[PDB]
Symmetry: D2
């Protein structure tokens, strides 16, 4: 199943879509600057692009840690990103009441991995009618992703993206099961599957891991820069596009 | 560090406390009925008991599974349980705004494992000043509990219980690391540690018994059941009495 | 099923047997010194005791590294231990050809965890007719122990002990699944199950104590270990817990 | 670091080498027919090819399932394969005494993963001076491979290949950590790294896993087929076409 996001066709047999951006919104000017680098690089490379950022870091290690600009500022910054660049955007939501107002602005709304079993958040997200990015919890097997998809379907929203971010591997370490992509395709109605390489690394390896995941034939790549050094983005993406073009050119089977 | 909960002393050197009850509150009649059975068994063996139920469960098996009776009626039911049986109670909260009114009634407030990192909820819970049960995520190592504890401390509350529920072991399976209890005690200032055996298992009674006995062998403040019962508790109490009556290793 | 080893009765509803000694045999006199200590401690505590040692270090730090006394002298040393102390002994074997000569001297022959699938070693060990300790591989599920037991049974030996030594938990780490003990009993015909706490352990004295206590809480035939008076402090506590558990009827 | 195996160059920057064959040597004529198919397909696609089989499978499903033709007959069969097709061969050894006779015939000798820390076998293998394929144990981290390599180096052999076969993931299951390839390259002096996809499993799965691995820039791919977890022999060509496509792309771009 493909999903149209404005003029972008997102699908597991379509050219890969870059979901790219930053950890958290910090100011308008820094956001616009970073986003302009992404747009410029992806435009020239011919890669469909969706800008990513959180408006709030809800689970930092200290109650005093900087959390980003917050929701009201955040949606103001997103509105300007959309106006200036004409691209879709994606952000995460942490509380049910945030969903509809966030969804008025942000094209794709994201269910954080920790909150996949917050059933009222699922319901509130589904009710917006927006495209949804479901972050696969590190504690959830690829065959059980269907359980989350089921909930969204029962709540009336079938515009769902499945986002790999690694699986718990002993303590304080993650492993990406390259077979999980295919399991998710087979068991969740071939919904778009994307790969968050950035959060998968938590514990030069970013390129190798990204290439490996995209070799399994995926709708998109999800990443953050500062995270990849921003100036390496073009060279990084040249590689990814080379591999994606090759895989997508091969008949399935 | 011990925590007084009404007449109960909760601590890793104290007789173990049983936490148990029902999944979600339906009605006063239904609640008092189940609570009465736990109360009768625990009173028969002299085991301290805290009744558990959810008034509004956000982590449900299905979208339309009953969440519980809700805040207003749920707290009335809890008030009744406390009055009738003279026991403390425990309930989970998932909304920051719910922490304060819940804390007027519920002796212990529980932080769901999936929300254990959610700063706004932690702060809202801390600010109640109530005893808090921190459920350890299956994806967090025991040495990361100190960070959650630290956030409660920042927000002004040190009346904290750490609750083991298992750790992710490949796909689907949970394993309980018996060494994790000690790691939590050493890094978190010997706070009360309790063992959620029921959720550690995601026949079944025989499994639960072995696992409960193994955990309680490590010297724990409590045992947590979302869950015959007399036979089980006799065995737990026997082991717990033996263990707690011996001094900790000499240094 | 119980196994008689001289006058020791080994089984899951009998008083636990200690399997203890040293990593690798180095010299007769240090061997006799160490064995003397275990014998003295276990005797005065009333615990049956089997002395353990390897005649060879199969995985060595360097290709030049020590290695141990080797089979020839190793068996000399075991002969003297048995003569001096009148106790049974246990050693591991790594090559099928070693099995019959080692079994002439050593009461229990041990299948190393990493060789548990070496079918020729399995067969060679079974052919000796000796008591066999099967070390559970750290990759193998407890239910799959029945496959190794089956091979020993087809090869004509049912005098088998199953030995827990932890399961792989991410990289460079082990966890002991306390539910595995019961699975092995249920699926392998209640053969004796013992717990290698030493190798399960990927301050640390209290870790080993907690872990041993948790395992022995599941009702086991024995404990396998290596070593101010820490052995007796440890064993006093293990014995007290084992005595309790073995006095309760099986549920 | 590259290794020359007859006229094949094996290395992490070279066109991938296929290490392909069967589980257990059972026979002469069937072995030759299977090998002939591997040869025909690999020659058609221009892919360097090394035939694989065990003559003595020590890890068996039952105590009396056939171990294989054994040392002397196995080596005779390998000699015939080499004579008939002009290709190198690879086999495994489980005992120090087997090392010399096997190394005299076989172009690569393989250290079984479960034996990879057995110092006596490591030394006996090293001292052959033969090219060695070291299977990474499923219970061993990628950063620990340098310790096996060190032991080979101490015994005088540096012609070493490191072979991924997955890591233990919960019970009775494996996952392939795609980051481990790079860890092994960086910590083990960029020795050739190869990927045993067959034993990493437990197929469209085989193809996905193989492509993911080869995307990380590897010296070779290790697999088994069945003449009628092993790939169907008649689908070999389609499979290798897809692998070759990705390998040729990756290898044609400079490392970033
Ligand atoms: Cl994110
Ligand atoms: Cl997660
Ligand atoms: Cl959890
Ligand atoms: Cl092989
Ligand atoms: Cl292995
Ligand atoms: Na050779």
């Amino acid at each position: 199943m493909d999903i149209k996001i404005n003029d972008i066709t997102l699908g597991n047999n379509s050219p890969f879509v870059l979901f790219g951006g930053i950890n958290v919104l910090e100011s308008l000017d820094s956001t616009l600057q970073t986003c302009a680098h992404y747009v410029e690089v992806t435009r020239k490379l011919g890669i469909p692009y969706i800008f990513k950022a959180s408006f709030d870091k809800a689970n930092r290690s200290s109650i005093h840690s900087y959390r980003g600009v917050g929701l009201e500022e955040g949606l103001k910054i997103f509105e300007k990103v959309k106006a200036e660049f004409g691209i879709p955007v994606i952000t995460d939501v942490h509380e049910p009441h945030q969903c509809q107002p966030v969804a008025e602005v942000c094209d794709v709304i994201q269910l954080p991995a920790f909150l996949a079993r917050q059933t009222d958040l699922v319901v509130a997200m589904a009710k917006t009618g927006n495209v949804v990015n479901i972050k696969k919890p590190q504690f959830l097997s690829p065959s059980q992703m269907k359980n989350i998809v089921e909930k969204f379907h029962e709540a009336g929203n079938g515009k769902l993206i499945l986002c790999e971010r690694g699986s718990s591997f002993g303590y304080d370490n993650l492993v990406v099961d390259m077979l999980g992509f295919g399991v998710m395709k087979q068991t969740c109605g071939n919904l778009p599957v994307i790969f968050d390489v950035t959060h998968s690394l938590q514990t030069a390896q970013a390129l190798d891991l990204a290439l490996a995941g995209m070799a399994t034939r995926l709708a998109g790549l999800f990443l953050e820069s500062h995270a990849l050094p921003l100036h390496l983005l073009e060279d990084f993406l040249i590689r990814i596009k080379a591999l994606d073009d090759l895989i997508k050119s091969q008949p399935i089977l």
